Write a protein that binds this ligand. Structure first.
Ligand SMILES: Nc1nc2c(ncn2[C@@H]2O[C@H](COP(=O)(O)OP(=O)(O)OP(=O)(O)O)[C@@H](O)[C@H]2O)c(=O)[nH]1
Ligand SMILES: Nc1ncnc2c1ncn2[C@@H]1O[C@H](COP(=O)(O)OP(=O)(O)CP(=O)(O)O)[C@@H](O)[C@H]1O
Ligand SMILES: Nc1nc2c(ncn2[C@@H]2O[C@H](COP(=O)(O)OP(=O)(O)O)[C@@H](O)[C@H]2O)c(=O)[nH]1
Ligand SMILES: Cc1ccc(S(=O)(=O)Nc2cc(-c3ccc(C#N)s3)ccc2C)cc1
Ligand SMILES: [Ca+2]
Ligand SMILES: [Mg+2]
Ligand SMILES: [Mg+2]
Ligand SMILES: [Mg+2]
Lengths: 438, 54, 429, 339
């Protein structure tokens, strides 16, 4: 067994981390004080959940997590909320003065003063690992901490652990729920610094999670709590193969093998189905076919785009609940004829499939209902370039006038980094268009 | 359309189905860049102090 | 980023300042004696941003009160909440400032400024993490205008990496103490465009019209004007004094409002509009609040938004209401009048909601606009300036204190450059 | 009150559409780069579908179906008809055609040409991208192209009288956001002025019926019908008087079959039924009726220009059907093709 360290950066990172770990605990039977009656082997184990938990002499299970925010409010909620005892205080790191939505304040100004402390705590966590796999890193694109300090951290992790895979969970900015006008700046900036340091990032446009929570959870104005519960449903679908018995995606290296042939194009599209209101009085349970079919409906994607006008490079289907290979192959056969699924010529048309018999776990008092079967499709499709297009466009709109640039220079950056990141994004957009369009 | 590498366990199954075959910087470098931004930032602060001195 | 240090300077400065401390003391459940007597714990969760906790578990405003004559400070101290303030923070001269910028910035005020800074320091050193400072003053007098800009300059020197925020009252002929106010205002605008992160332009002409045309007050007092200003100050600082999802601070506000560093002069707005006398009992619908808060007749800087374009907007709703209906109405405002928002700053209107309504209202909306229309204000002043200066009229009052006409040429020229910039982005792309 | 921008200033149809929108007093027009619009009348190339339908509190519509080029470029149309199963290889209404790249299907085009020359039946072809060259010899074509398309020439077309002249049929079809297929009732018929000559293939004007080409190299142009165009009333009345049949029976049934088949074939690829932005589009289908009264499909144009008489009526029909459907305000001219 090999271990995975989670790192949550900035407000969105820390909150989504909360949600995920709460979910992990419910799924694994781990109580809020760290006691897992399921675990007969006390003080240690060579089990699959040990990928994400370490065991104490007192039989306590503690996440391989680090929360880091340059500002104390959200990690103080963690330090006082329901899952106090779960975490070692040395793992919850705060500053006193945030990065004021300013990438340059997080990367240079405030980052330089806290990166060494963050890396020492991360190494004190790696030091309880027989064979560390790598890192899951949760952050936002739009935040000052979430972009600046995250990319500095990714740099340093590459240089200290050059042989460990690194996975990102990025929160793409959406105007309905975004805080700041310079989120398109930070986004581009941090992507340019992190592209060569990340092995597979899973973008999540807030806009999508928002419309899903409106249409399907029947929530009027969704909050961060709703978004984060749904996002953790997805994250757990994507990380279950690490914490459970199985032969698909059983280590971080398999993710870049099954989903990333070209290393620059490492942003897979996650599509999750079915999302059903816990308040639905009467609900008819969807078949394998109905949820596999829903996987190809853009209204169910973490990023609104149209895969019909891109080409696919790799597809993986992750089922939780009552599913059997027969019905998956049947559904696929039907869907290939009913849908438009074009692969790149240099890649076989087909699906790597994973079934876990344990149906989705839902938070008591959440908004999602229990279902008999659910699925998450990870697909590396070029159509995701749309989300960069939009982003790049907004970027240009401001930079054309050098608007807000002085806030970044004030912290020590150089206009050159703006242009150089933008050019990198231009390369990335063009690469997507090479691989995909005709 | 054929299955490949079916693996079964108590927790679930996993397999592949195929339909059609086909046709870094150092520590000193990042330390140097952080310190270059801190220098530019110090220079700006000094200019501000000079203008306020005047 | 918790503690803010408040400073009020001069007559007008201390009079709006004292009203603001009343309004928010009432909002936090502090009585004039200094003791909390409210109900919700929401009234203490961010009490530190403006109040030190003192002996006896009382609360003392983190406010320094500055004048060059004792008059207005004596009357503040004998006022309603006068006993709230720390007596050490009452820093006054005796000679006054004669509505003379030069007296305040160069001569009489220079005797006093080091004392004021000593108290500032004693107040900062008692802070956990100081966000920055905020000043309420006028630009037409002498203590407020001249010494406020002096203080701003020295505070920037002592704390160069902190936010400097002002509530600045622009002078109008419709409400005028002396003929030399355009000189003091032009000198102060020079300083402010140099040394302030965020300035709330509060035009006295606008408050006069609002009291007269709107509130139907046939002969408005300075108190009728200060009521508006204290209500608006309370409304802008709501996101700071109360628990929110945003966790907003001064620095983020400056980062997101100020696309270019000299263009940090904001139009405030209130809605609904309320007089001391009439206490109207009709709750407003959310569409009503939004139509009103974006109405020019609800803006405290006597500019016409339609004569320009909005660089950035920040809106603050207060009270129990539908956030869905809010977002709806706010998007409705943006899309029905898109020509008036700049296309090169995507999604440049941002909104905050607080669940607590202010005293007397159940629904409140407060508006913070960085519009290019503000150039109008600065042109207005500049015209009034030149009508005198082309004849060096009243300049002896300033030359007698050592100032040279070159300083006036420079200050005017800096303000005309400010006007140029605003105009430039008013027609960009 | 709805907002719309206009990102193609050279479009006759949507020019009259802008005009009629503004005249309702319920549409305002914005600058092109303003994202806060309801309706985009977008450009013909590199249209930014990646940016549509991401503006909260705005229902967005656009006048082009993303993916429709695969029916409206000549090479991609040919390849779609060949490969797509619903449009069988034996598709009886598409002239047998092959794609060629300059120095592929070169090999199979030659194989078919030779299989034909054994029977020695008419083997004229046409090369297509005004750049188009008809010939009976493979080598002249291949030296002219050195991406083009080589299509069997319909050697025996229906010839109008008096005059003895060929023609093509343009139909206009409106596909709205719900993927209803509306055929405009007033199709147009673009004729040759100077008579069809079987052997004189080098006079461009006898065989090519492009109105462009007619207003220039035509000896007389506008003799029989004004502007070289015959509308459906005259075409029907002539067909009744001369061949004892109807336009609707001998021609329009097949036209509706072809339109319905092409559009329902590409439907799953381009339908915006569940997307975050909607599309409508106006296509122009170019048909050719051989002397047996059989209809053939030549091309589909995605940006098409109407005829000067029908502009007002068709553009009012577009605003009614494709636009007022999404954005309501305060005997139809279209035939619904049922699928
Ligand atoms: N889905 C989701 N998005 C969030 C959440 N919290 C913040 N965001 C998004 O993140 C962006 C701002 O990022 P933050 O995480 O608040 O920024 P930060 O990392 O705290 O950086 P600072 O500016 O220094 O506080 C906005 O676009 C928000 O939409 C969350 O809990 N869930
Ligand atoms: N295989 C064929 N058989 C008979 N006639 C043909 C033919 N190919 C072309 N033609 C004639 O020549 C003309 C062909 O031009 P075509 O329509 O292919 O170019 P075009 O200019 O219309 C491109 P577009 O689709 O934009 O209209 C038609 O008007 C038709 O009369
Ligand atoms: N809004 C408002 N303006 C005032 C008040 N008192 C004075 N002013 C304005 O301030 C200017 C004179 O400033 P003043 O405060 O007396 O200057 P000082 O010498 O700095 O105290 C004039 O434009 C007055 O209109 C007040 O209570 N409210
Ligand atoms: C265009 C844009 C984008 C982002 C922001 S925000 O990040 O500054 N949030 C925010 C802050 C405030 C205040 C801070 C301190 C105050 C007192 N003094 S009010 C008020 C409203 C809002 C919405 C603002 C404007
Ligand atoms: Ca164990
Ligand atoms: Mg934060
Ligand atoms: Mg006075
Ligand atoms: Mg044509």
């Amino acid at each position: 067994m090999r271990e995975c360290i989670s790192i949550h950066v900035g407000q969105a990172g820390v909150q989504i981390g909360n949600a995920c770990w709460e979910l992990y605990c419910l799924e694994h039977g781990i109580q809020p004080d760290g006691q897992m009656p399921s675990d007969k082997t006390i003080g240690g184990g060579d089990d699959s959940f040990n990928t994400f938990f370490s065991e104490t002499g007192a039989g306590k299970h503690v996440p391989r997590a680090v929360f880091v925010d340059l500002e104390p409010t959200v990690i103080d909620e963690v330090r006082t909320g329901t899952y106090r005892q779960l975490f070692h205080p040395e793992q919850l790191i705060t500053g006193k003065e945030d990065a004021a939505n300013n990438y340059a304040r997080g990367h240079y100004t405030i980052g330089k003063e806290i990166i060494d402390l963050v890396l020492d705590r991360i190494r004190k966590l790696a030091d309880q690992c027989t064979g560390l796999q790598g890192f899951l890193v949760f952050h936002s694109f739009g935040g000052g901490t979430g972009s600046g300090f995250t990319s500095l951290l990714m740099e340093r992790l590459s240089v200290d652990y050059g042989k460990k895979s690194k996975l990102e969970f990025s929160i793409y900015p959406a105007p309905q729920v975004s805080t700041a006008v310079v989120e398109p700046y930070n986004s581009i900036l941090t992507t340019h610094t992190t592209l060569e340091h990340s092995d597979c990032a899973f973008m999540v446009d807030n806009e999508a999670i928002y419309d899903i929570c409106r249409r399907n959870l029947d929530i009027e104005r969704p909050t961060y709590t709703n978004l984060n519960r749904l996002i953790s449903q997805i994250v757990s679908s994507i990380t279950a193969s690490l914490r459970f018995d199985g032969a698909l995606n059983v280590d971080l290296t398999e993710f870049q093998t099954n989903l990333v042939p070209y290393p620059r194009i490492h942003f897979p599209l996650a599509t999750y189905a079915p999302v059903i209101s816990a308040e639905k009085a009467y609900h008819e349970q969807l078949s394998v076919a109905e949820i596999t079919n829903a996987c190809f409906e853009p209204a169910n994607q973490m990023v609104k785009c149209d895969p019909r006008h891109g080409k696919y490079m790799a597809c993986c289907l992750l089922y939780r609940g009552d599913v059997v290979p027969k019905d998956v192959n049947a559904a696929i056969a039907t869907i290939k004829t009913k849908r438009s699924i074009q692969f790149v010529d240099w890649c076989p048309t087909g699906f790597k499939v994973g079934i876990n018999y344990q149906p989705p776990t839902v938070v008591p008092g959440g908004d999602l209902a229990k279902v008999q079967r659910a699925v998450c499709m990870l697909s590396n499709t070029t159509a995701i370039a749309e989300a960069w297009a939009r982003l790049d466009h907004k970027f240009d709109l401001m930079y054309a006038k050098r608007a807000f640039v002085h806030w970044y220079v004030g912290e020590g950056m150089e206009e050159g980094e703006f242009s150089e990141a933008r050019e990198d994004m231009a390369a990335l957009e063009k690469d997507y268009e090479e691989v995909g369009v005709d | 359309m054929e299955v490949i590498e079916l693996n079964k366990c108590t927790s679930g199954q996993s397999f592949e189905v195929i339909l059609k075959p086909p046709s870094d910087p150092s520590l000193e470098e990042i330390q140097k860049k952080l310190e270059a931004a801190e220098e530019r930032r110090k220079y700006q602060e000094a200019e501000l102090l000079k203008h306020l001195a005047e | 980023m918790r503690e803010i240090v408040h400073i009020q300077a001069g007559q007008c400065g201390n009079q709006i300042g004292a009203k603001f401390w009343e309004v928010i003391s009432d909002e936090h459940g502090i009585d004039p004696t200094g003791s909390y007597h409210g109900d919700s714990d929401l009234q203490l969760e961010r009490i530190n941003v403006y109040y030190n906790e003192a002996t006896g578990n009382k609360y003392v405003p983190r406010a320094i009160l500055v004048d060059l004559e004792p008059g207005t400070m004596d009357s503040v101290r004998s006022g309603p909440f006068g006993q709230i303030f720390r007596p050490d923070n009452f820093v006054f001269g005796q000679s006054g400032a004669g509505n003379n910028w030069a007296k305040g910035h160069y001569t009489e005020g220079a005797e006093l400024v080091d004392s004021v800074l000593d108290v500032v320091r004693k107040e900062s050193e008692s802070c956990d993490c100081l966000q920055g400072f905020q000043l309420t003053h006028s630009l037409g007098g002498g203590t407020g205008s001249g010494m406020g800009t002096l203080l701003i300059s020295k505070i920037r020197e002592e704390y160069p990496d902190r936010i400097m925020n002002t509530f600045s009252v622009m002078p109008s002929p419709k409400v005028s103490d002396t003929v030399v106010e355009p000189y003091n205002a032009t000198l102060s605008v020079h300083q402010l465009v140099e040394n302030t992160d965020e300035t709330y332009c509060i035009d006295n002409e606008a408050l006069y019209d609002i009291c007269f045309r709107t509130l139907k007050l046939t002969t408005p007092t300075y108190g009728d004007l200060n009521h508006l200003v204290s209500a608006t100050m309370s409304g802008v600082t709501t996101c700071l004094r109360f628990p929110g999802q945003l966790n907003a601070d001064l620095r983020k506000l400056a980062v997101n409002m100020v696309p270019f560093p000299r263009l940090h002069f904001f139009m405030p707005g209130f809605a609904p509009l309320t007089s001391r006398g009439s206490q109207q009992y009709r709750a407003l619908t959310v569409p009503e609040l939004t139509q009103q808060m974006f109405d020019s007749k609800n803006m405290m800087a006597a500019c016409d938004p339609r004569h320009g374009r909005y660089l950035t907007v920040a809106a603050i709703f207060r009270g129990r209401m539908s956030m869905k209906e809010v977002d709806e109405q706010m998007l409705n405002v943006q899309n029905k009048n898109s020509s008036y928002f700049v296309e090169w700053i995507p999604n440049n209107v941002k909104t905050a909601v607080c669940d607590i309504p202010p005293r007397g209202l159940k629904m409140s909306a407060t508006f913070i606009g960085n519009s290019t229309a503000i150039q109008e204000l600065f042109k207005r002043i500049s015209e009034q300036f030149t009508a005198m200066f082309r004849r060096k009229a009243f300049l002896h009052w300033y030359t007698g204190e050592g100032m040279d006409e070159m300083e006036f040429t420079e200050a005017e020229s800096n303000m005309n450059d400010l006007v140029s910039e605003y105009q430039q982005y008013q027609d960009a792309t | 009150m709805y907002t719309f921008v206009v990102r193609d200033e050279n479009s006759s149809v949507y020019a009259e559409v802008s005009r009629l929108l503004l005249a309702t007093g319920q549409w305002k027009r914005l600058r092109k780069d303003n994202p806060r619009f309801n309706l985009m009348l977008g450009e013909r190339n590199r249209l930014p579908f990646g940016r549509l339908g991401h503006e909260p509190g705005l229902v967005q519509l656009v006048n082009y179906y993303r993916g429709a080029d695969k029916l409206c470029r000549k090479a991609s149309l040919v390849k779609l008809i060949k490969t797509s199963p619903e449009l069988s290889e034996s598709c009886t209404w598409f002239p047998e055609s092959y794609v060629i790249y300059p120095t592929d299907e070169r090999e199979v085009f030659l194989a078919a040409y030779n299989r034909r020359r054994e029977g020695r039946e008419g083997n004229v072809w046409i090369a297509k991208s005004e750049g188009i060259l008809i010939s009976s010899e493979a080598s002249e074509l291949l030296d002219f192209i050195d991406v083009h398309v080589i299509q069997k020439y319909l050697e025996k077309p229906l010839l109008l009288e008096p005059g003895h002249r060929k023609f093509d049929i343009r139909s206009w079809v409106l596909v709205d956001h719900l993927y209803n297929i509306y055929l405009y009732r007033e199709g147009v018929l673009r004729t040759s002025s100077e008579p069809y000559n079987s052997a004189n293939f080098q006079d461009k004007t006898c065989h090519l019926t492009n109105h462009c080409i007619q207003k220039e190299y035509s000896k007389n142009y506008g003799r029989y019908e004004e502007g070289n165009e015959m509308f459906f009333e005259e075409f029907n009345q002539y067909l009744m008087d001369a061949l004892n049949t109807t336009l609707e029976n001998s021609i329009l049934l097949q036209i509706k079959h072809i339109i319905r088949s092409c559009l329902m074939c590409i439907e799953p690829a381009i339908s915006t039924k569940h997307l975050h932005y909607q599309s409508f589009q106006l296509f122009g289908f170019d048909f050719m009726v051989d002397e047996e009264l059989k209809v053939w499909l030549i091309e589909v144009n995605g940006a098409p220009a109407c005829a000067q008489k029908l502009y007002a009526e068709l553009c009012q029909g577009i605003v009614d059907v494709a636009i007022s459907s999404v954005f309501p305000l305060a005997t139809s001219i279209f035939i619904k093709l049922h699928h």
